[PDB]
Design an enzyme around this catalytic site. Sequence first.
Site, PDB file in Angstrom:
ATOM      1  CB  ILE A 112      -1.160   0.098   1.349  1.00 60.15           C
ATOM      2  CG1 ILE A 112      -1.665  -1.341   1.197  1.00 60.15           C
ATOM      3  CG2 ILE A 112      -1.858   1.340   1.007  1.00 60.15           C
ATOM      4  CD1 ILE A 112      -2.461  -1.635  -0.001  1.00 60.15           C
ATOM      5  CD  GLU A 113       4.702   1.363  -3.313  1.00 57.09           C
ATOM      6  OE1 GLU A 113       5.253   2.197  -3.682  1.00 57.09           O
ATOM      7  OE2 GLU A 113       4.945   0.273  -3.171  1.00 57.09           O
TER       8      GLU A 113
END
Length: 296
Positions: A112-113
């Site tokens: 998750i970025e």
Amino acid sequence: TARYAPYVDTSLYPAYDLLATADATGVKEFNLAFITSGGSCAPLWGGVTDLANDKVAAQIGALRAKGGDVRVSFGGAAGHELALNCSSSSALAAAYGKVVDQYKLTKVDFDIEGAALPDTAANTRRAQAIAQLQRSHPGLNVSFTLPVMPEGLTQPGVDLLADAKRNGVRVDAVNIMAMDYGPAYSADMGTYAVQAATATQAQIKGVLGLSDAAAWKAVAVTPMIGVNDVSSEIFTVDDATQLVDFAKSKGIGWLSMWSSTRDKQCAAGAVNHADATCSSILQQPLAFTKAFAAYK
């Protein structure tokens, strides 16, 4: 749980040969990357490739026959994580589940970025989905892969983990992306990785409510090998051996790296920017894979 599982970008041509790497190095555990959305609440490799057609995922059965396995990774820097394309946690759990069920997965990773990481509403929807997935698939091992600074997880990473915990997710590893810090961070990238991991352990000890020993086992570290996207930053093979030493003294959960395809010298030799298919430093093929294999 395996101690070293490098990332393999399945979108790159030619398809990475998992078995050939296992024969050459003994490393037979991989993080296959990435499942994203192609515009629907439906999983696709690289946002475009159907589950039955991916030529790296097609190798899973043969790798398992040699006793290896894979963790499939959702999200990543490119493209759009499914939580941003699924309106409900039930639809989202269904999308993730088609992946788990397609390949009979026992390990998954949520990278998750970018724009996904500060989306608090999507994060809760994801955490609800993962808790449901962990209920229908008991023992399914879940890792979160998050940006990191030498000072530890960023506040949006800390908040994502707190949301996961209160929503009943069992976070088995927090895998930090010990890479791409910025122009104000020009020192050794191995020491930075050690520093980032030390801070992360203190943070997830509290957020995830773990013992000191359990919090070290929940740490995982993933450097960018060679020249980083921040081009002035280089993670050398020397840096890999320092990270291996540190992983041994603390009992870190696992190491990984970005990426297996980059674990070879570029055709031009050393180059001063990052490339998806080589490391931009001088090296022999699979140098980083052999270096990190010392952690097994």
